[PDB]
Each structure stands twice: as C-alpha cells, then as structure tokens.
Design a protein around this motif. Structure first.
Motif, PDB file in Angstrom:
ATOM      1  N   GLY A   1      -4.406  11.233   0.028  1.00 36.37           N
ATOM      2  CA  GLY A   1      -5.010  10.384   1.037  1.00 36.37           C
ATOM      3  C   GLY A   1      -5.511   9.067   0.496  1.00 36.37           C
ATOM      4  O   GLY A   1      -5.798   8.144   1.256  1.00 36.37           O
ATOM      5  N   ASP A   2      -5.603   8.978  -0.824  1.00 31.75           N
ATOM      6  CA  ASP A   2      -6.016   7.751  -1.494  1.00 31.75           C
ATOM      7  C   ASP A   2      -4.993   6.638  -1.255  1.00 31.75           C
ATOM      8  O   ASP A   2      -3.782   6.884  -1.281  1.00 31.75           O
ATOM      9  N   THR A   3      -5.472   5.419  -1.004  1.00 33.92           N
ATOM     10  CA  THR A   3      -4.564   4.291  -0.795  1.00 33.92           C
ATOM     11  C   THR A   3      -4.543   3.393  -2.024  1.00 33.92           C
ATOM     12  O   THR A   3      -5.582   2.923  -2.496  1.00 33.92           O
ATOM     13  N   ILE A   4      -3.344   3.134  -2.523  1.00 38.63           N
ATOM     14  CA  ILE A   4      -3.180   2.426  -3.780  1.00 38.63           C
ATOM     15  C   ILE A   4      -2.553   1.052  -3.576  1.00 38.63           C
ATOM     16  O   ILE A   4      -1.568   0.893  -2.855  1.00 38.63           O
TER      17      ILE A   4
ATOM     18  N   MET B   1       4.911  10.717  -6.031  1.00 33.41           N
ATOM     19  CA  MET B   1       3.599  11.235  -5.663  1.00 33.41           C
ATOM     20  C   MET B   1       3.011  10.437  -4.506  1.00 33.41           C
ATOM     21  O   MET B   1       2.033  10.856  -3.886  1.00 33.41           O
ATOM     22  N   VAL B   2       3.625   9.291  -4.216  1.00 33.25           N
ATOM     23  CA  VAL B   2       3.106   8.350  -3.224  1.00 33.25           C
ATOM     24  C   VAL B   2       4.163   7.962  -2.194  1.00 33.25           C
ATOM     25  O   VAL B   2       5.364   8.113  -2.433  1.00 33.25           O
TER      26      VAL B   2
ATOM     27  N   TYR C   1       0.828  -1.202   0.000  1.00 28.30           N
ATOM     28  CA  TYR C   1       0.000   0.000   0.000  1.00 28.30           C
ATOM     29  C   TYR C   1       0.858   1.247   0.000  1.00 28.30           C
ATOM     30  O   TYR C   1       1.846   1.344   0.734  1.00 28.30           O
ATOM     31  N   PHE C   2       0.480   2.192  -0.852  1.00 25.20           N
ATOM     32  CA  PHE C   2       1.112   3.498  -0.879  1.00 25.20           C
ATOM     33  C   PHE C   2       0.001   4.515  -0.658  1.00 25.20           C
ATOM     34  O   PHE C   2      -1.135   4.295  -1.082  1.00 25.20           O
ATOM     35  N   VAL C   3       0.320   5.625   0.000  1.00 22.75           N
ATOM     36  CA  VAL C   3      -0.666   6.681   0.178  1.00 22.75           C
ATOM     37  C   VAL C   3      -0.287   7.864  -0.697  1.00 22.75           C
ATOM     38  O   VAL C   3       0.875   8.268  -0.747  1.00 22.75           O
ATOM     39  N   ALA C   4      -1.277   8.411  -1.390  1.00 24.45           N
ATOM     40  CA  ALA C   4      -1.045   9.541  -2.269  1.00 24.45           C
ATOM     41  C   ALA C   4      -0.739  10.796  -1.455  1.00 24.45           C
ATOM     42  O   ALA C   4      -1.470  11.141  -0.525  1.00 24.45           O
ATOM     43  N   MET C   5       0.349  11.473  -1.798  1.00 30.30           N
ATOM     44  CA  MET C   5       0.725  12.698  -1.101  1.00 30.30           C
ATOM     45  C   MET C   5       0.210  13.910  -1.860  1.00 30.30           C
ATOM     46  O   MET C   5       0.198  15.025  -1.335  1.00 30.30           O
ATOM     47  N   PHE C   6      -0.210  13.691  -3.102  1.00 28.74           N
ATOM     48  CA  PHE C   6      -0.631  14.797  -3.952  1.00 28.74           C
ATOM     49  C   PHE C   6      -1.830  14.404  -4.798  1.00 28.74           C
ATOM     50  O   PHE C   6      -1.982  13.230  -5.140  1.00 28.74           O
TER      51      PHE C   6
END
Lengths: 65, 12
Positions: free
Chosen positions: A31-34, A61-62, A3-8
């Motif tokens: 805040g989206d989790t990818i 970006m993540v 999981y990565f969280v979007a910083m932008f």
C-alpha cells in the motif's frame, strides 16, 4: 516522476538476494506509494524515494499508477 | 549483476 504502489511487504535484510540490499534497496509494506525517478534499470529495479530515503525497488513488487 | 527477489504467491 512516477508513482508505484507496493503489492507486497519487502524487507531487504531478510528477503533480498543481494547481500548489500539492506543499505541500497528500499524497505516497504503493501500500500506504500513510491516516488520513482527515471526508468527500470537492466537489473529490473526502479530508483526512488520513500519516507525521505532513496534506494532501489524490485519491479515485481510494485505496480505503476 | 543486481539480482531480483522472487515474485511470491498471490497479490493481496
């Protein structure tokens, strides 16, 4: 899978240097989790899924959890 | 090959 969280916020239509980015790069807000599968590719992109769709994600970006 | 977008200004 990681999981990565979007910083932008990222809108490949208007923000990607890749003219094809709109169909191949994933769209996301902060805040989206990818769901990222495998490792970063040589270009600097992850492969993953968000809201049932798969595409490429720029690593700058993540952030990895 | 595939190009990265620029890293922006500040985190949050």
């Amino acid at each position: 899978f990681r999981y990565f969280v979007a910083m932008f916020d990222y809108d490949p239509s208007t923000m990607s240097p890749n003219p094809d980015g709109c169909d191949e790069e994933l769209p996301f807000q902060e805040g989206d989790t990818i769901k990222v599968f495998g490792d970063k590719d040589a270009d600097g992109f992850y492969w993953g899924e968000l809201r049932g769709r798969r595409g490429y994600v720029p690593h700058n970006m993540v952030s990895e959890v | 090959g595939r190009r990265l977008p620029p890293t922006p200004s500040k985190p949050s």
